[PDB]
Scaffold this active site. Structure first.
Site, PDB file in Angstrom:
ATOM      1  N   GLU A  11       0.810  -1.227   0.000  1.00 29.35           N
ATOM      2  CA  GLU A  11       0.000   0.000   0.000  1.00 29.35           C
ATOM      3  C   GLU A  11       0.820   1.244   0.000  1.00 29.35           C
ATOM      4  O   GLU A  11       0.362   2.327  -0.380  1.00 29.35           O
ATOM      5  CB  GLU A  11      -0.885   0.031   1.239  1.00 29.35           C
ATOM      6  CG  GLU A  11      -1.872  -1.146   1.237  1.00 29.35           C
ATOM      7  CD  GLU A  11      -2.925  -1.009   0.164  1.00 29.35           C
ATOM      8  OE1 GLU A  11      -3.108   0.004  -0.483  1.00 29.35           O
ATOM      9  OE2 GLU A  11      -3.646  -2.087  -0.005  1.00 29.35           O
ATOM     10  N   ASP A  20      -7.203   5.952  -4.762  1.00 34.44           N
ATOM     11  CA  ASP A  20      -6.685   4.618  -5.001  1.00 34.44           C
ATOM     12  C   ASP A  20      -6.946   4.278  -6.469  1.00 34.44           C
ATOM     13  O   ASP A  20      -7.413   5.093  -7.262  1.00 34.44           O
ATOM     14  CB  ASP A  20      -7.366   3.590  -4.070  1.00 34.44           C
ATOM     15  CG  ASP A  20      -8.851   3.506  -4.360  1.00 34.44           C
ATOM     16  OD1 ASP A  20      -9.425   4.126  -5.254  1.00 34.44           O
ATOM     17  OD2 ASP A  20      -9.460   2.714  -3.540  1.00 34.44           O
ATOM     18  N   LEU A  32      -9.020   3.459   3.025  1.00 36.40           N
ATOM     19  CA  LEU A  32     -10.068   4.068   2.204  1.00 36.40           C
ATOM     20  C   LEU A  32     -10.908   5.021   3.051  1.00 36.40           C
ATOM     21  O   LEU A  32     -11.425   4.638   4.095  1.00 36.40           O
ATOM     22  CB  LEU A  32     -10.997   3.013   1.572  1.00 36.40           C
ATOM     23  CG  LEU A  32     -12.288   3.579   0.942  1.00 36.40           C
ATOM     24  CD1 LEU A  32     -12.000   4.085  -0.466  1.00 36.40           C
ATOM     25  CD2 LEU A  32     -13.350   2.485   0.865  1.00 36.40           C
ATOM     26  N   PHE A 104      -7.988  -7.014   2.387  1.00 33.60           N
ATOM     27  CA  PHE A 104      -7.651  -5.660   2.772  1.00 33.60           C
ATOM     28  C   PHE A 104      -7.832  -4.757   1.581  1.00 33.60           C
ATOM     29  O   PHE A 104      -8.371  -3.645   1.644  1.00 33.60           O
ATOM     30  CB  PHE A 104      -6.149  -5.549   3.151  1.00 33.60           C
ATOM     31  CG  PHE A 104      -5.744  -4.163   3.656  1.00 33.60           C
ATOM     32  CD1 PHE A 104      -5.375  -3.167   2.745  1.00 33.60           C
ATOM     33  CD2 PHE A 104      -5.715  -3.861   5.029  1.00 33.60           C
ATOM     34  CE1 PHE A 104      -4.967  -1.902   3.191  1.00 33.60           C
ATOM     35  CE2 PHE A 104      -5.278  -2.617   5.501  1.00 33.60           C
ATOM     36  CZ  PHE A 104      -4.925  -1.637   4.564  1.00 33.60           C
ATOM     37  N   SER A 117     -10.661 -19.863  -7.990  1.00 28.23           N
ATOM     38  CA  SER A 117      -9.327 -19.703  -7.449  1.00 28.23           C
ATOM     39  C   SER A 117      -9.306 -20.075  -5.981  1.00 28.23           C
ATOM     40  O   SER A 117      -8.390 -20.745  -5.482  1.00 28.23           O
ATOM     41  CB  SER A 117      -8.814 -18.302  -7.614  1.00 28.23           C
ATOM     42  OG  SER A 117      -8.907 -17.967  -8.977  1.00 28.23           O
ATOM     43  N   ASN A 132      -6.109 -18.683 -12.445  1.00 29.03           N
ATOM     44  CA  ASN A 132      -7.417 -18.087 -12.421  1.00 29.03           C
ATOM     45  C   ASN A 132      -7.410 -16.708 -11.805  1.00 29.03           C
ATOM     46  O   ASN A 132      -8.200 -15.857 -12.177  1.00 29.03           O
ATOM     47  CB  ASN A 132      -8.418 -18.964 -11.703  1.00 29.03           C
ATOM     48  CG  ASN A 132      -8.844 -20.063 -12.608  1.00 29.03           C
ATOM     49  OD1 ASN A 132      -9.885 -19.930 -13.273  1.00 29.03           O
ATOM     50  ND2 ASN A 132      -8.022 -21.118 -12.638  1.00 29.03           N
TER      51      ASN A 132
END
EC number: 3.2.1.17
Length: 164
Positions: A11, A20, A32, A104, A117, A132
């Site tokens: 991040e 973002d 966020l 996250f 997946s 995938n």
């Protein structure tokens, strides 16, 4: 390496509001702020989360405190999501961080959306999972980071992050 350090690398760290990849107002270590496209709305959410007249700017400690709240939230999300839990449970500690990492980043629902997946993960079908995961908007959106994540799932090691 651990999930904090790992996410810290993915991040990064910003002391001022920024957007973002999806265009959301964010701050710190991928915190966020709001889904409103309004900056004003963001500044207001920021002061509320920080509990200070910030002026769009926070300190490092401030960023870490949000970060802690956020990792905790991502953890709760993986542990509490009906779909995710069983998979988390089946994973080794390393691949568990990867999974938390994704939550996250995009929330539990998003992650749960990788139906197959996650299925392959639960079944240790590493390459099939990887493939995938790579076939996604997520991957296209943030390829560099997706690539590290997928390498982790693929290898089960911190090779992708440890020399960063």
């Amino acid at each position: 390496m651990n999930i904090f350090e790992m996410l810290r690398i993915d991040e990064g760290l910003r002391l001022k509001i920024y957007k973002d990849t999806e265009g959301y107002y964010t701050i710190g270590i991928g915190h966020l702020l709001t889904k409103s496209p309004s900056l004003n709305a963001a500044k207001s959410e920021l002061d509320k989360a920080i509990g200070r007249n910030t002026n769009g700017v926070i300190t490092k400690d401030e960023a870490e405190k949000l970060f802690n709240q956020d990792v905790d939230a991502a953890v709760r999300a993986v542990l509490r999501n009906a779909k995710l839990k069983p998979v988390y449970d089946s994973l080794d500690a390393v691949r568990r961080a990867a999974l938390i990492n994704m939550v996250f980043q995009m929330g539990e629902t998003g992650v749960a959306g990788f139906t197959n997946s996650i299925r392959y993960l639960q079944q240790k079908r590493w390459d099939e999972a990887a493939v995938n995961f790579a076939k996604s908007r997520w991957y296209n959106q943030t390829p560099n980071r997706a690539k590290r994540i997928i390498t982790v799932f693929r290898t089960g090691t911190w090779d992708a992050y440890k020399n960063l």
